[PDB]
UniProtKB/Swiss-Prot annotation, chain B:
<feature type="binding site">
    <location>
        <begin position="32"/>
        <end position="38"/>
    </location>
    <ligand>
        <name>ATP</name>
    </ligand>
</feature>
<feature type="binding site">
    <location>
        <begin position="60"/>
        <end position="64"/>
    </location>
    <ligand>
        <name>ATP</name>
    </ligand>
</feature>
<feature type="binding site">
    <location>
        <position position="12"/>
    </location>
    <ligand>
        <name>ATP</name>
    </ligand>
</feature>
<comment type="function">
    <text>Part of the Rad50/Mre11 complex, which is involved in the early steps of DNA double-strand break (DSB) repair. The complex may facilitate opening of the processed DNA ends to aid in the recruitment of HerA and NurA. Rad50 controls the balance between DNA end bridging and DNA resection via ATP-dependent structural rearrangements of the Rad50/Mre11 complex. The ATP-bound conformation promotes DNA end binding and end tethering, and alters Mre11 nuclease activity. ATP hydrolysis promotes both Mre11 activity as well as HerA/NurA activity. Also has reversible adenylate kinase activity.</text>
</comment>
<comment type="subunit">
    <text>Homodimer. Forms a heterotetramer composed of two Mre11 subunits and two Rad50 subunits. Homodimerization is promoted by ATP binding.</text>
</comment>
<protein>
    <recommendedName>
        <fullName>DNA double-strand break repair Rad50 ATPase</fullName>
    </recommendedName>
</protein>
<comment type="similarity">
    <text>Belongs to the SMC family. RAD50 subfamily.</text>
</comment>
<feature type="binding site">
    <location>
        <position position="136"/>
    </location>
    <ligand>
        <name>ATP</name>
    </ligand>
</feature>
């Protein structure tokens, strides 16, 4: 039954990761290394270690697996909240996130993305800025 | 599930914060220290109290700055609009209501225990953390090899 679960989560993650990578990776393989979920990717018919992924591909894989888990556990994705999905000022991950925001996240009913990155504004539908002013958080609805 | 509005008063750097969420991608930008992080903790308290989130229960040593910590959250799930309001007296007050007609009506006894039991049935905490909310570092954790 365990293997049945693993194969299913892998199938769901494979479709999303393939979309996020424009078909570069055909599959995400999910295994349980002594009850500790491990991921591998398939490229040109071979399973490869995650060290072969670029920084943008790593964020795409992590996001694909999370989205796969939402479908697996809840059967759909109505709301997605992400807190600082990329490391501070990581450029490569920024670009991939923007592409994912434009092509996939915009189709989810509601997404709440919390980030330090000003460059993500154009890819969002609504922008709210929160800043510490005179010791208190201040909300500015930008759009 | 869809969030509509969160109001946070006297929780960490939030003196009087109101955030209205809409359809689509809602980007909340700010630099560490801004209060963007604690805004998410306040939503978690709103839905899932009691849970271990610091700075919610505080002691008072002076009347200066003395104010209740207040979190009000309006959200929707499967066509019904809900509102959970929590107040922490520096004693606690908790109410969860659903909009019926033009009136907010209690879905259960206004107590932490009753509301926590109802939420575990409406949208369990594990579904929220494992399917809806991707906390900081979770993408990294998933790629551990």
């Amino acid at each position: 039954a365990r293997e049945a679960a693993l194969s299913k989560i892998g199938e769901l993650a494979s479709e999303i990761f393939a979309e996020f990578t424009e078909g570069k990776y055909s599959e995400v393989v999910v295994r349980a290394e002594e009850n500790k979920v491990r991921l591998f990717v398939v490229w040109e018919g071979k399973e490869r270690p995650l060290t072969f992924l670029s920084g943008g591909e790593r964020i795409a894989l992590g996001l694909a697996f999370r989205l796969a888990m939402s479908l697996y556990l809840a059967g759909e994705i109505s709301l997605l909240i992400l807190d600082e999905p990329t490391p501070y000022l990581d450029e490569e991950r920024r670009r991939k996130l923007i592409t994912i925001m434009e092509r996939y996240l915009k189709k989810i009913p509601q997404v709440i993305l919390v980030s330090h990155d000003e460059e993500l504004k154009d890819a969002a539908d609504h922008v709210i800025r929160i800043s510490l002013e005179n010791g208190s958080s201040k909300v500015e609805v930008v759009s | 599930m869809k969030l509509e509005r969160v109001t946070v008063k006297n929780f960490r750097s939030h003196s009087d914060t109101v955030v209205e969420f809409k359809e689509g991608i809602n980007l909340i930008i700010g630099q560490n220290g801004s209060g963007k992080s604690s805004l998410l903790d306040a939503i978690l308290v709103g839905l899932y109290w009691p849970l271990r989130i610091k700075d919610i229960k505080k002691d008072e040593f002076t009347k200066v700055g003395a104010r209740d910590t207040y979190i009000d959250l309006i959200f929707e799930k499967d066509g019904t609009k809900y509102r959970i309001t929590r107040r922490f007296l520096k004693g606690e007050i908790h109410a969860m209501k659903r909009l019926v007609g033009n009136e907010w009506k209690h879905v259960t006894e206004p107590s932490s225990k009753a509301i926590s039991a109802f939420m575990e049935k409406l949208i369990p905490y594990n579904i929220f953390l494992n399917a809806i909310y991707i906390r900081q570092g979770q993408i990294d954790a998933i790629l551990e090899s």
